[PDB]
């Protein structure tokens, strides 16, 4: 629908529709951005990435609702939670097909690069909470491959301290905890990146210093519910 | 239950 | 896209829909049980009331913070606030087509017939909320006639105390201060419908009670701002 | 600013 809209007329149209809370017209408006071909801005990475986090977040909220309603429990509450989940699906996969065609294959900086295969990770980890059995045993692998490349780069290309580097560990670690079954592997990671963040904030400005420990919070609060 | 990443990791660049 | 779904899977899925704060969902839904062509019970009049209410919401929010944008203020931010106002107008357009196609006549009691009449009222002041110039002045009359059949219906036929009347009141009230510059019939309406009610209350019992002093602490909440 | 309705406007029938 956006093929006949400019690139920059796009990207504002994002920034407005975001002010509005508008965030099925921002995703359209950034994958329309995304398919002109060109790679995109740091600032254009996030408004992505805040785009189509809020709309599947509101399917995800939405799904679980139905889930839990279905599972007190005619056949109304299975085919609506069937309906929000197809939907919740195709967001994932619209996603999932920005980022590859051709977002990663052109991604060389690590905070390129990280960014989207950590949100490869994050939407077949979306897809992972509503599969089941052995759909389910692929995707989680699909997951769990993004992740481990994002976080062998991560380790190699930035300090401990990264926003980029602790949002990866940080959600590695969620899918740990609650896809993978694996809670002592996140207890563990969670751990470590803190750790090794704390260790290195000497090194930061002011700035920089609460980007770093507002993402250290959250590994804490994980650990403060895990342990 | 969990907390996940916010959106955008960080203010700039 | 409904007609091939009983009527009462539409309302159930409605339910859930609301559940899962899914408005559009459940505006859907609850558009197709319409369309089935009978009327609709109170339960179901409050359904298709909080499902559209809800979509309108969150478009007028949006157009409010378009609009302010452009006020301070390329083409892009007009272009927005009018794909958002296009998109409001057609809400309004559907559910006033709805009223007209056939509600509001096959409504004979007086709590069917208010009710699709102040909605009438409503969906004409939202439009009038975004209109301008000579089409405003015809909005503005479409939705006064509404208002006023209804007030007429509602003082013959319901007392002082009754929610819908007192909701029309309070909604007519509101057209009066912020869509037709009648500051002074607003506050004089506001304060002889919560002064008629009042004195009513004591006909009441503890559950109806409740029912009617939420909408009178509105109409207080309103002569505080106005006064 | 000023307030209207909510969309139900009572508990019951
Ligand atoms: N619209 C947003 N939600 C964001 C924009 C930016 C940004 C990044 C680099 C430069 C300018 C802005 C964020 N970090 S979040
Ligand atoms: N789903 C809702 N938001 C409502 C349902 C009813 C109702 C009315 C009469 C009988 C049963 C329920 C409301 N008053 S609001
Ligand atoms: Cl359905
Ligand atoms: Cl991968
Ligand atoms: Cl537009
Ligand atoms: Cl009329
Ligand atoms: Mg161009
Ligand atoms: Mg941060
Ligand atoms: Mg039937
Ligand atoms: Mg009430």
Not at chain 1, 49 to 61: E, L, P, T, W
Not at chain 1, 118 to 126: A, H, L, S
Not at chain 1, 154 to 173: D, V
Not at chain 1, 193 to 221: C, G, N, P, V, W
Request: glycine content about 6%.
């Amino acid at each position: 629908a956006m093929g006949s809209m400019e690139r920059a007329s796009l990207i504002q149209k994002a920034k407005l529709a975001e002010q509005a809370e508008r965030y099925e017209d921002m995703a359209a408006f950034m994958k329309g951005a995304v398919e002109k071909g060109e790679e995109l801005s740091c600032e254009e990475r996030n408004l992505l990435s805040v785009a189509y986090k809020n709309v599947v977040g509101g399917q995800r909220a939405a799904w679980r609702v139905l889930s839990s309603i279905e599972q007190k429990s005619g056949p109304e509450v299975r085919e609506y939670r069937e309906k929000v989940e197809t939907e919740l699906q195709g967001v994932c996969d619209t996603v999932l097909g920005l980022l590859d065609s051709h977002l990663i294959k052109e991604a060389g900086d690590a905070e390129s690069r990280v960014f989207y295969l950590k949100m490869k990770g994050d939407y077949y980890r979306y897809l992972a909470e509503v599969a089941t059995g052995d759909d389910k045993k692929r995707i989680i692998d699909s997951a769990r491959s993004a992740y481990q490349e994002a976080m062998d780069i991560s380790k190699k290309e930035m300090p401990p301290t990264n926003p980029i580097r602790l949002g990866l560990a940080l959600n590695f670690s969620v899918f740990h905890y609650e896809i993978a079954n694996s809670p002592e592997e996140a207890i563990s990671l969670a751990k470590t990146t803190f750790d090794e963040a704390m260790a290195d904030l000497h090194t930061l400005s002011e700035d920089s210093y609460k980007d770093s420990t507002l993402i250290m919070q959250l590994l804490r609060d994980n650990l403060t519910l895990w342990t | 239950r969990s907390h996940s990443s916010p959106a955008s990791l960080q203010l700039g660049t």
